[PDB]
Design a protein around this ligand. Structure first.
Ligand SMILES: Nc1ncnc2c1ncn2[C@@H]1O[C@H](COP(=O)(O)OP(=O)(O)NP(=O)(O)O)[C@@H](O)[C@H]1O
Ligand SMILES: Nc1ncnc2c1ncn2[C@@H]1O[C@H](COP(=O)(O)OP(=O)(O)NP(=O)(O)O)[C@@H](O)[C@H]1O
Ligand SMILES: [Mg+2]
Ligand SMILES: [Mg+2]
Ligand SMILES: [Zn+2]
Lengths: 347, 613, 656
DNA sequence: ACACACTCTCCAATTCTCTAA
DNA sequence: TTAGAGAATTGGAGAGTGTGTTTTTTTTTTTTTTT
């Protein structure tokens, strides 16, 4: 029975029913429906029988004109600024945070080699006000999961074995596979998850061999996280949130709160992000390769005379590709490399 | 009734026209007749469904839409063909009345009738279908009675009778009571002749849709399959499989009087006619492969070519690649006449700084070995890694599952001390033994172990002892054949070379794609896998005096000369030299180990152990 | 309803059987057995198929054709138990000796029944009622050989074999206790004073309730029938289960098993934990009554046992036939058996001769003692190996696991103190509690090998304390309060603390065992891996040869094979050599010196703890084992000084 | 289909009665 | 007073018919993952 009909303090009543031929396989669980059918009884106290219903009726990608708008956006000379401005517009300042979230949403490009090795596409960011951004990312992203560090069950963030025969269940790394996941307090991570997130992030997998269980789980996702150590090495970029205290801002927020108590929009931006992820996966030009390698050896030499490592060069490449992706340019260029290293100043 | 004869005739014409099936009948018969005079091949033949289409469309659609009326006469005609061909005289008592005809199987072009458990629907009942999925359950094998023979005591006459049940025949008949007759029509007491009677094997299984196809987190759906005679026990749970058979219904469906008001449906099954696996490892060589493998083996430096063709996307670490190749080839396992066992398989450990491709290189073995299991060191317990109790039943762990294969362990330094000590038996005795409440058993675990770890101080410290940098007991390090230390030493030209290499790697595009679309000589990996398989099956190098002269000298010098060597040297080091020399001789496809192999093996062990060449 | 031809006529084979029983010889062989049966001296007849094959060959070489009875009784074995029995009944000779016939109730009953018929006149009863014997077939020798000679694992027993005679290899899992089963039932009619019989074959039957005898009927005498035990015929019955060896199970599968039935004198032959070659007839088990009508065509199945071959002769099974006598005389006449037997243990391992000599004395063991007031003293010897990694400890330990007829191997990490000793499991679905013995019970009257002894948990190792000294187990848990027997000798192996032995500390610091447990080993051997260019070269040359040839290198020494070694040890474990006063004085004086030296040096780097009274009895046990190996009936001082040397040498590794 | 509980039916065993020697 | 011919009453032999059957703790010993 309908939830807004039930008398107070009682659990809802229900019925069982049958259909055949073309009325089969027409609905799925959780959907609200209207039914026309014969109401009758069947055999299964004294002179008493069970009731049921025999059903006789039930009631319950892009166009060309869509992508033309996305193409017009793609050739705008200030598109990067426009998307950054459109992200959590109530939050003051924090320019580079917004820029990093755009790159996290857009991602790099996945690749597979002749000797079978596999090259990651995702992006990972950490934030040290901050509560609002994770909710915004959850709303704008095509797929999203939100959690606090203790997790929804004894699976925690990653996965665990539980008990009577033993079984296994996955946390909110396995469940977000293929999409984005955001963690609301990364410091409240459990002990098992502290060690297990290394495999989940480096390999995009979780593997378990305990109590006769022997399986491997997929963890293909981009992680956003916030807190307040060596675990920072897992992320591509790390930043610290900043605040400003203009009274007009608080008064405006309060006036809006009273109003409810008494640039690009979200759905259009989400559809655009989906379109770009489906249409383009760009490649480095040779000029970018010379530039990046020269910069890499320059920083290592400077540090030697006074660390940078290959696992960070391969992160700068992913950021560069994600920046070229907004323009739908099939090749990445020095314009993107410059902004990539400029934005790499996490420190 | 008369139509049955004409269908037998028409299939006889098919069998005479397409002659490759006569050769199959005859070859099975002569093979079985040969070894019978000293395994035996089944009386079964697989027909291409395309030949039958091109021969007679009216018979093809009949087999494919009305199998209960076309498969039996066709199968009868096959038996007449095999029976008319010549056969061994004077058959025994059991052979004379076996009740064992030949049987058919099919391949090719099912069209609309190629299905999956989710989409099998009431419209398809009594049709011949093909389904795909995963095996989830299997019954025990049971014998089933179909014919019994009796000897009449007074008259000296042998009598017999036949039995039927709904799953034994495509057509439908009156069921039989499973009773044995005790007395003759003429009142004579009877006796039952076991050994002349005929029984057949029976097994039921269940097949479920693959999890990759499950919608919306909904419940998955499955079907039961019936197997018999030759098809029994060719599968186990977790197998991906494709099954061919007739889809049929059973029983009274509650219309024989029941309390249900007949809301419940009829039961249904698939009668297994043919079973094929799915690859989701093994390959079979063609003649050209043998030629190419043998010709390539005569190059001057095959070891360099093959080793550099492992993980070409990883720059450097030549010696570790060579060690991995020798591990994939392996030594030779010895069993002496008094039952004593000598180990053959090589174990490798590598420890080093962050980001130096340890996990990336370890990942390559998992995608070129024929059987490989992967695990992280902290995601596994001692019992889960070896074996555990359940209900009493004993359940295998990862090292028992990869028996004649390789096991990869990443983040080895995070494994607790209580978990590590379970491994000490498996890496030398190659067995697992349990002694717990209600159980005592031994299990086999013959695999090779390869693993990666981080040093104690987070980076390797040359200004402290190797034991201080590597917190593992001496009894465990002794069990690894080769121990490699690797570091990220900052240098200009090294940095430049590596960075240019990874940038060239990231500019790859796969063959069938335009730019920006989403997705010396080196032998290809699909050829290298054949080379390794062939070399491991067909050549077993024996040791020689010239090789021994090198091995003894190197072992005694290496043990007795005082040096800052990074691993304890024991009686197991000698065996590492013998194993490595044997594996190198095997790469070379040599029937014997020579002085060259011993020399190379010594020069690899010296590098890993004493750090310099 | 229909009928067929077949190539076999049973009349011809019956004629062959009756000729074979009265003609074959290696007088004729089987007539002696039937004379013993007739004399009531013998209860069972074992038919050898090697005889039938020999008979066929001899009849062929005499230029005559004959049917292949050997394959004929392998293909359809069930029917020929009846044919042979009828032939034996036909040809049975008369007794050679007086019997006291009046002891038989059946004789009196049948004599009186015959007399009733004789008076009335002025088949009677089923022949099974008077068969005083059992009959079994023994399969073809594989060295003469056919399928019955070739062992099958429990997976290879397909449905094709139903009815045939086969051989099976595996481990027994459980055994039932004996109970009677009826064959012929006997009844009495009250009114007409007449007796009737019924024969039972199926698993169930309906008893009779009306006297259908023609005389009783014609007198219209509707009398009542009553059952009687005193003239019924029973036979002993037992049921067992066999299961495939764990090292033959294919990957990812669960082991399979078979049900075995045993009747007659063959009862209580099998025991749990035995590895065995059973041979018998494989048959189906039909349903009965209303159950059969709705059971379907799927048949249950089982194996009728006929003969049993064990892989290793238990030491208790020994008797000195002259066949064994002739072989032990080879070793006795050759001389210096102590060194040859010790050198013959694991020849593929170089050196280590004193360790091997100690382990030979472990295989022999001391003499059990029981004083007139009821005190008893341990006879078993306990040994421990303590040493560096890579010195063949596990290898040597696992080699001795092959020689002993009863033994088990276990490792410290894989083992629970409960499962090592005995467990109280709530095993059935009925919530019943049942006791099930552990590894130390399965090793009763044998050796128990425990590897990685230093990895086992400190709490679990305490379970071994009672078994080591008292050779028994005591349990007091939910619903169970009993003592079990565990007459087992323990052999264990360990690495010192920190792995490789550390010379900075004392031996007791390195050993790291508590005093109460360190005392329970009669010998603890300390073996260290110290480099030497000379010794390393010799070891390497030996090992490389073994890898090249699969044979130990030899110029002078031939090891005795394990079979002849088992015969010598089994013969030697029967002797019980006694001490003497001259020997007693010597060992009494030795013991004082050991305790004085211990007291002097409890402070010292050369300390190993304090000598308790259990060190005296260790000397006596080692001395008596040495006396057993020389087949003496008297301990000699020559034994005592060797027993002291063998204890002294264990500590010399400390001095490089 | 296989032991049981219960119902139905026909046939001859039995005792009673009448008659005459 | 015996006995033998005819009639009536009762018993149970035995033939027939329908039927039923397979098939949430609470307490206590032991292994395993989790803090
Ligand atoms: N020639 C190379 N040398 C070193 N690293 C390389 C090389 N080529 C690629 N890499 C990259 O190095 C990164 C780290 O490799 P990985 O194998 O995870 O290092 P690791 O030894 O496991 N480090 P860690 O996980 O901290 O123990 C990956 O992103 C590789 O793609
Ligand atoms: N004297 C010897 N003769 C022959 N082989 C030897 C000898 N000493 C050591 N070995 C070899 O040493 C190897 C390891 O033997 P093993 O029994 O496993 O050592 P272990 O004493 O059990 N070491 P561990 O388990 O680490 O304490 C085997 O392959 C033996 O062949
Ligand atoms: Mg890594
Ligand atoms: Mg060992
Ligand atoms: Zn009677």
């Amino acid at each position: 029975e309908i939830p807004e009909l039930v008398p107070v303090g009682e659990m809802p009543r229900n019925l069982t029913m049958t259909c055949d031929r073309y009325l089969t396989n027409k609905v799925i669980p959780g959907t609200r429906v209207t039914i026309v059918g014969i109401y009758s009884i069947y055999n299964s106290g004294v002179a008493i029988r069970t009731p049921y219903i025999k059903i006789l009726g039930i009631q319950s990608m892009f166009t060309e004109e869509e992508e033309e708008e996305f193409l017009q956006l793609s050739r705008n000379p200030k598109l990067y600024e426009i998307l950054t401005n459109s992200i959590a517009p109530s939050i003051f300042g924090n320019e580079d945070i917004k820029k990093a979230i755009v790159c996290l949403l857009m991602g790099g490009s996945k690749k597979i080699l002749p000797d079978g090795m596999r090259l990651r596409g995702d992006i990972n960011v950490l934030l040290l006000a901050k509560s609002q951004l994770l909710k915004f990312v959850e709303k704008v992203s095509p797929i999203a999961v939100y959690t606090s560090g203790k997790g929804s069950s004894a699976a925690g963030l990653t996965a665990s074995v539980q008990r009577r025969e033993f079984y296994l269940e996955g946390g909110a790394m396995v469940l977000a596979d293929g999409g984005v996941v955001c963690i609301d307090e990364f410091d409240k991570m459990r002990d098992e998850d502290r060690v297990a997130i290394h495999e989940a992030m480096e390999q995009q997998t979780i593997s378990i061999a305990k109590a006769g269980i022997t399986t491997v789980l997929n963890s293909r996702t981009s992680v956003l996280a916030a807190a307040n150590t060596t675990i920072l090495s897992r992320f591509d970029m790390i930043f610290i949130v900043k605040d400003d205290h203009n009274e007009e801002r608080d008064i405006s927020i309060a006036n809006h709160v009273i109003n409810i108590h008494t640039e690009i929009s979200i759905e259009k931006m989400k559809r655009y992000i989906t379109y770009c992820r489906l249409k383009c996966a760009p490649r480095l030009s040779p000029q970018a390769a010379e530039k990046l390698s020269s910069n890499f050896v320059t920083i290592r030499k400077q540090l030697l005379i006074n660390p940078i490592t290959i696992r960070q060069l391969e992160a700068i490449i992913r950021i560069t590709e994600s920046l070229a992706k907004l323009e739908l340019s099939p090749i990445a260029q020095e314009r993107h490399v410059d902004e990539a290293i400029r934005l790499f100043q996490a420190s | 009734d008369a139509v049955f004869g004409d269908r037998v005739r028409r299939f006889q014409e098919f069998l005479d026209t397409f002659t490759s099936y006569r050769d199959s009948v005859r070859s099975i018969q002569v093979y079985n007749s040969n070894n019978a005079a000293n395994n035996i091949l089944p009386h079964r033949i697989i027909i291409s469904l395309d030949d039958l289409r091109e021969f007679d469309r009216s018979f093809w659609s009949g087999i494919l839409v009305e199998p209960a009326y076309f498969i039996p006469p066709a199968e009868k005609a096959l038996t007449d063909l095999a029976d008319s061909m010549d056969d061994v005289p004077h058959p025994n008592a059991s052979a004379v009345s076996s009740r064992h005809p030949w049987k058919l199987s099919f391949k090719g072009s099912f069209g609309a009738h190629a299905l999956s458990p989710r989409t099998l629907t009431a419209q398809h009942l009594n049709k011949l279908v093909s389904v795909e999925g995963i095996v989830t359950k299997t019954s025990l094998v049971r014998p089933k009675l179909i014919r019994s023979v009796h000897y009449a005591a007074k008259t000296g006459r042998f009598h017999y009778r036949d039995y039927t049940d709904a799953t034994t025949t495509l057509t439908t008949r009156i069921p039989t009571p499973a009773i044995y007759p005790t007395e003759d029509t003429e009142g004579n007491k009877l006796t039952t002749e076991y050994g002349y009677s005929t029984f057949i094997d029976h097994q039921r299984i269940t097949v479920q849709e693959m999890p990759e196809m499950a919608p919306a987190g909904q419940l998955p759906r499955s079907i039961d399959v019936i197997l018999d005679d030759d098809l029994v026990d060719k599968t186990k749970p977790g197998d991906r499989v494709n099954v061919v058979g007739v889809f049929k219904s059973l029983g009274a469906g509650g219309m024989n009087q029941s309390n249900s008001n007949t809301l419940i449906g009829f039961k249904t099954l698939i009668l297994g006619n043919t079973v094929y696996p799915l690859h989701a490892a093994r390959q079979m060589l063609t003649d050209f492969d043998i030629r190419n493998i043998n010709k390539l083996s005569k190059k001057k430096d095959i070891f360099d070519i093959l080793s550099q063709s492992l993980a070409p996307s990883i720059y450097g670490h030549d010696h570790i690649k060579k060690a991995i190749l020798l591990m994939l080839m392996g030594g030779v396992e010895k069993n002496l006449e008094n039952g004593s066992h000598l180990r053959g398989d090589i174990n490798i450990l590598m420890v080093g700084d962050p980001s130096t491709a340890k996990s990336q290189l370890l990942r390559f073995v998992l995608n070129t070995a024929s059987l490989a299991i992967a695990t992280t060191g902290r995601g596994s317990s001692g019992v889960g890694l070896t074996a555990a109790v359940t209900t009493r039943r004993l359940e295998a762990g990862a090292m028992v599952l990869a028996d004649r294969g390789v096991v990869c362990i990443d983040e080895f330094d995070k494994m607790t001390d209580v978990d590590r000590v379970a491994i000490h038996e498996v890496m030398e005795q190659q067995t697992v033994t349990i002694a717990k409440a209600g159980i005592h058993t031994t299990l086999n675990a013959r695999c090779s172990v390869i693993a990666a770890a981080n040093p104690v101080f987070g980076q390797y410290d040359v200004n402290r002892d190797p034991h201080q940098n590597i917190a593992l007991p001496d009894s465990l390090l002794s069990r690894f054949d080769l121990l490699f230390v690797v570091t990220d030493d900052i240098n200009e030209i090294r940095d430049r070379s590596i960075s240019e290499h990874v940038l060239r790697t990231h500019r790859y595009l796969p063959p069938g794609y335009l730019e920006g679309e989403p997705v010396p000589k080196l032998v290809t990996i699909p050829f290298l896998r054949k080379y390794v398989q062939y070399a491991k099956e067909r050549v077993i190098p024996q040791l020689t005096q010239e090789a021994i002269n090198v091995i003894v000298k190197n072992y005694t010098d290496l043990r007795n000369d005082d040096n800052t060597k990074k691993s304890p040297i024991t009686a197991r080091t000698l065996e590492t030299l013998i194993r490595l020399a044997t594996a190198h001789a095997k790469v070379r496809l040599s029937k014997t180990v020579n002085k060259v192999d011993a020399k190379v093996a010594a020069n690899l062990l010296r590098f890993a152990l004493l750090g310099e060449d | 309803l229909p009928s067929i031809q077949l190539p076999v006529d049973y009349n011809n084979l019956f004629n062959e059987i009756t000729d074979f029983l009265v003609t074959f010889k290696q007088g004729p062989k089987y007539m002696a057995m039937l004379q013993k049966v007739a004399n009531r001296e013998l209860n069972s007849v074992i038919i050898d198929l090697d005889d039938i094959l020999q008979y066929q060959n001899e009849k062929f070489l005499q230029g005559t054709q004959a049917d292949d009875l050997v394959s004929a009784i392998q293909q359809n074995a069930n029917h020929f138990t009846e044919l042979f029995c009828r032939a034996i009944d036909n040809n049975m000779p008369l007794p050679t000796k007086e019997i006291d016939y009046k002891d038989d109730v059946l004789d009196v009953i049948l004599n009186q029944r015959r007399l009733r018929n004789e008076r009335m006149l002025s088949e009677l009863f089923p022949p099974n009622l008077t068969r005083r014997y059992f009959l079994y077939f023994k399969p073809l020798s594989q060295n003469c050989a056919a399928i019955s000679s070739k062992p099958l694992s429990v997976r290879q027993i397909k449905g094709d074999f139903l009815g045939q005679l086969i051989t099976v290899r595996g481990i027994i899992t459980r055994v039932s206790d004996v109970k009677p089963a009826v064959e012929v039932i006997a009844y009495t009619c009250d009114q007409c004073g007449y007796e009737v019989f019924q024969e039972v074959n199926s698993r169930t039957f309906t008893p009779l309730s009306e006297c259908t005898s023609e005389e009783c009927s014609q007198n219209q005498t509707k009398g009542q029938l009553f059952m009687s035990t005193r003239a019924s015929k029973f036979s002993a019955f037992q049921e067992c289960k066999i299961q495939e060896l764990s090292q033959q199970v294919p990957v990812g599968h669960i082991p399979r098993s078979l049900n075995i039935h045993v009747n007659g004198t063959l009862v209580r032959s099998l025991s749990p934990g035995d590895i065995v070659d059973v041979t018998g007839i494989f048959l189906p088990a039909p349903y009965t009554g209303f159950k059969a009508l709705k059971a379907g065509l799927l048949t249950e199945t089982y194996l009728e046992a006929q003969f049993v071959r064990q892989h290793k002769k238990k030491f208790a099974s020994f008797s000195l036939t002259s066949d064994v006598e002739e072989r032990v005389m080879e070793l006795i006449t050759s001389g210096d058996v102590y060194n040859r037997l010790a050198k013959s243990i694991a020849p593929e391992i170089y050196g280590n001769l004193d360790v091997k000599k100690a382990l030979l004395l472990l295989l022999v063991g001391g003499v059990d003692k029981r004083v007139g007031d009821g005190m008893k003293i341990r006879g078993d010897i306990n040994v421990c190996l303590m040493g560096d990694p890579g010195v063949a400890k596990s290898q040597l330990l696992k080699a001795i696991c092959k020689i002993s007829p009863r033994g088990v191997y276990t490792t410290g990490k894989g083992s629970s103190g409960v499962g090592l000793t005995a467990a109280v499991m709530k095993d059935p679905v009925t919530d019943e509690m049942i006791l099930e013995g552990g590894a130390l019970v399965l090793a009763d009257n044998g050796i128990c090998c425990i590897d990685e002894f230093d990895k086992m948990d400190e709490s679990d190792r305490t379970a071994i304390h009672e078994v080591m000294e008292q050779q028994t187990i005591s349990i007091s848990k939910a619903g169970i309060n009993t003592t079990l027997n565990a007459r087992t000798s323990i052999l264990a192996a360990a690495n010192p603390l920190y792995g490789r032995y550390n010379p900075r500390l004392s031996p007791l610091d390195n050993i790291n065992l508590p005093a109460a447990l360190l005392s329970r080993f009669d010998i603890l051997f300390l073996m260290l891996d110290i480099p030497s260019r000379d010794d390393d070269e010799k070891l390497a040359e030996h090992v490389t040869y073994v890898h090249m040839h699969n044979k130990q290198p030899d110029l002078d020494f031939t090891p005795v094979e394990p079979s002849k070694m088992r015969e010598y040890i089994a013969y030697a474990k029967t002797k019980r050599p006694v001490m003497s006063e001259a020997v007693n004085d010597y060992v009494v004086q030795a013991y004082i010196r050991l305790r004085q030296d211990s007291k002097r040096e409890m402070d010292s780097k050369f300390s190993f703890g304090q000598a308790t009274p259990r060190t005296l009895l260790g000397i006596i046990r080692l001395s008596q084992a040495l006396a057993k190996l020389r087949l003496a009936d008297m301990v000699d001082i020559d034994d005592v000084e060797e027993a002291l040397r063998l204890v002294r040498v264990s500590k010399e590794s400390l001095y490089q």
